[PDB]
RNA sequence: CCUCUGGUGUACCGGUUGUGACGCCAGUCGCAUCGCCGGGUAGCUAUGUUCGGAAGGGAUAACCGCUGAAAGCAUCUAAGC
């Protein structure tokens, strides 16, 4: 695997500690750990981490090279981060924020109070966009699908959440 | 379930026909589908009354995912959620 090969680095900041399979990484965000699997093994070198079967398994190469992509991703959100956003499309369509909770109007007959998990944090310049920040990659990823699936972009024209960087497939009636 | 509305209610009350008897009048009783007819207490009962299939947890089906390599990309999956 290129991607296991592939080394890691620890930028200045952030301390990676182990015991057992359980990988700490350590920042200014916070705490992330990572459950390791039994065929790959982790080796903490200078400031770069190598990634490495403990065998010569396919399997192993596999486990190495998915490994090595989520400590990358840990301590890349440790230190920098990760934002993703989000864009409201439609009449009367907005959202706000109330510390740890967001409102939502999206044309039904009720609003919708989505309480947000720890770790993650959203902002609201306008009504229509919001940015969703986390030091968790997957954390992120998982709260703005669920904010998408509250209503997802429809393909008539294009009305409900979306992705900032997302393609709608557009059709016409008729 | 029987407070209400009703049915039934041949051991509750009354009207009335024929006949026989209680010595006779009066008053009663036997028999005639409970003789026939009109009501009707409890009990039972429906067509009457009240109530029930409310709400919430857990694992899932098709399906939709998050992150993610094998396969430098992509990918709901092989680890993991």
Not at 8 to 16: K, R
Not at 73 to 76: A, E, G
Not at 125 to 140: G, R
């Given at each position: 695997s290129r991607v296991a090969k592939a080394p890691?680095?620890?930028?200045?900041?952030?301390?990676?500690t182990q015991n057992g399979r359980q990988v700490e990484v350590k920042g200014s965000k916070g705490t992330l750990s990572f459950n390791l699997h039994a065929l790959v093994?982790?080796?903490q070198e200078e400031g770069k981490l190598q990634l490495a079967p403990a065998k010569e398994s396919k399997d192993a190469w596999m486990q190495a090279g998915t490994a090595r992509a989520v400590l990358n991703?840990?301590?890349?959100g440790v230190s920098e981060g990760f934002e993703r956003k989000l864009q409201l499309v439609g009449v009367g369509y907005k959202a706000a924020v109330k510390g740890t909770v967001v409102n939502l109007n999206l044309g039904y007959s009720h609003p919708i109070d989505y309480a947000l998990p720890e770790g993650v944090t959203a902002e609201t310049?306008?009504?229509?966009?919001?940015?969703?920040?986390?030091?968790?990659?997957?954390?992120?990823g998982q709260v703005a699908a669920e904010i998408r699936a509250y209503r997802s972009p429809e393909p008539y024209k294009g009305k409900g959440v979306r992705?900032?960087?997302?393609?709608i497939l557009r059709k016409e009636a008729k």
């Open positions: 890691v680095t620890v930028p200045n900041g952030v301390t990676v093994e982790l080796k991703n840990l301590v890349k310049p306008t009504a229509t966009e919001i940015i969703l920040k986390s030091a968790n990659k997957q954390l992120l992705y900032s960087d997302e393609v």
